[PDB]
């Protein structure tokens with residue numbers, strides 16, 4: 001092919017930040033003679049030339065420039081806008097001319113007014129006491145504007161270490177943060193926030209997810225002489241109360257000192273007359289959960 005370009009389809013940024021556009025190319029007609037960066041170019045069919053605002057011209061050309069061309073005449077078309085503005089948003093046009101040929105390359109530059117939020121990616125299955133990696137992705141990375149990704153649990157910064165990686169190549173531009181932590185059952189339903197911050201820790205944007213932590217049933221056991229009176233062969237009722245269970249429970253059974261009881265497959269244990277330790281067991285798709293032992297005495 002005469003002109004082959006490699007660059008991201010779209011580059012993202014927000015007002016006041018910067019944008020770094022990785023770009024490589026190759027023209028079979030040799031080195032370039034002119035480069036012009038257009039903003040929303042329009043081909044003028046009359047004059048057979050391109051019109052529109054010009055952000056950079058190789059004929060008129062520094063490090064004190066907002067728009068910079070970090071490339072050369074043979075293989076590099078990297079662009080830098082520092083700072084980038086909402087008006088730069090749109091379709092950039094890399095208008096290049098070789099010895100005998102011409103070419104126009106389109107790069108999409110999506111600049112939002114406010115910093116856009118990152119994205120949390122949850123694994124489909126999170127369960128109590130099983131280490132899980134949470135990933136926070138941001139489709140942005142520019143050297144002139146360093147950022148950071150902060151993990152929060154119920155608005156509180158998390159103490160677990162988070163590996164932060166960045167990519168700024170012709171294929172993809174992102175900032176990635178991976179957090180490893182072992183959740184407990186109480187993390188179910190709580191909010192995790194990936195907060196985007198600038199170099200000094202100033203808030204920019206955030207994404208939140210409500211955790212879904214599967215766990216065995218957590219059981220509250222209540223006995224209704226309040227303790228252990230009976231003193232004869234009285235009537236005692238014991239109830240098994242599920243404090244939390246994800247997913248919902250399936251079966252319930254009562255156990256004395258060790259072995260399950262006679263056909264006691266209900267949430268209430270009714271004794272009408274056997275004076276050991278008692279506890280209930282409730283199961284869900286995760287597995288069985290037990291309650292604390294109650295000691296009945298005559």
Ligand SMILES: CC(=O)N[C@H]1[C@H]([C@H](O)[C@H](O)CNC(=O)c2ccc(-c3ccccc3)cc2)O[C@@](OCc2cccc(Cl)c2Cl)(C(=O)O)C[C@@H]1O
Nearest residue numbers: 002003040041043045091092093101102103104105106107
């Ligand atoms: C090797 C070769 O074929 N070179 C010829 C070169 C390539 O074919 C041309 O660059 C390849 N890209 C495109 O088509 C292109 C790129 C970007 C955008 C765009 C759109 C919206 C926003 C931002 C960007 C649109 C099209 O096209 C030329 O004429 C272009 C021409 C002529 C008449 C009528 C029209 Cl409408 C047009 Cl676009 C030239 O000088 O660019 C002659 C050269 O000889």
Ligand SMILES: *[C@@H]1O[C@H](CO)[C@@H](O[C@@H]2O[C@H](CO)[C@@H](O[C@@H]3O[C@H](CO)[C@@H](O)[C@H](O)[C@@H]3O)[C@H](O)[C@H]2NC(C)=O)[C@H](O)[C@H]1NC(C)=O
Nearest residue numbers: 021022023024070071072075076077078080143144169170
């Ligand atoms: C096209 O050519 C330009 C210029 O040679 C290349 O830009 C250079 O890219 C490197 C990264 O590969 C930049 O290094 C960075 O420096 C900052 C500190 O300024 C540092 O914190 C980073 O970790 C990184 O090391 C370098 O500054 C930059 N040069 C200029 C003048 O901006 C560009 O990579 C080339 N494009 C491709 C697609 O290869």
